[PDB]
Amino acid sequence: SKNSINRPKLTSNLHHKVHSLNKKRAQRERAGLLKPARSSVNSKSGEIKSVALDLYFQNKKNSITTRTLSKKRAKKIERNLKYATQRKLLVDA
């Protein structure tokens, strides 16, 4: 800032950074990568958060992730869901 003292440097850099970050946030919002509000129907607030069950119900409804399901855990989930619906039917009747 000594070779150009009458030119702003830091204020311009910070203007650039704030616009930088605002655009990235808006695009991460448009791409649906950020979680929705608390009261939206697709929200998960107060419930349990587990990628295993999320993937289970997604592959039941049935571009690169680290999220898998462990077929072991898939069988366990089917087992426990059979138990759950058995109890619900016993309430049924």
């Binding site: 800032s1 000594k2 003292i5 009458n6 702003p8 440097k9 830091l10 204020t11």
Partner: protein, 197 residues
Amino acid sequence: VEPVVVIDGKGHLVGRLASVVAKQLLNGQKIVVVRAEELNISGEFFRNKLKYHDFLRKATAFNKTRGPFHFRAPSRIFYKALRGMVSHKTARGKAALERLKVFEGIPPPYDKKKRVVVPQALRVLRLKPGRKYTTLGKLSTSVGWKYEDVVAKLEAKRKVSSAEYYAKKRAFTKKVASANATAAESDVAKQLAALGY
């Protein structure tokens, strides 16, 4: 009370102007200094030239390229005097100094604008008469500023243009004041006089 304040450096004292300006920038006011070549310092020329030489002999020994950079221009002298007040090694001080602009002479767009002064920094008001003072263009040309002959040649043109402007404005003002004096004595003007206008 303005977005930007243009200050004519003529007749001012470097350190006092630096203090008021610094405390204004740190408060958030945008300021633009002009006519730094006509700025003044207290004390005789010899003293301040000796001081600048004392500053000029200071330099990193094992490599001169990374030492105190001795800028010769009056604008840069004033900038040094100012930067020594501000904590320029902080983001706050950087943002403050980025609200400032210093110029030798009055270039555009500030030539077509109003300038002001700072009465608690003027030589004629702060100093006692019978006291030697120094001017910054002379000092800088002594210590190696090679542009004082262009700024005078350009100010001599700016002043002529401004004199034309003033001669036009002054006749317009005469017309306006005469028309107002003729409008006076009307009951509207009497009511305005009663109410203080």
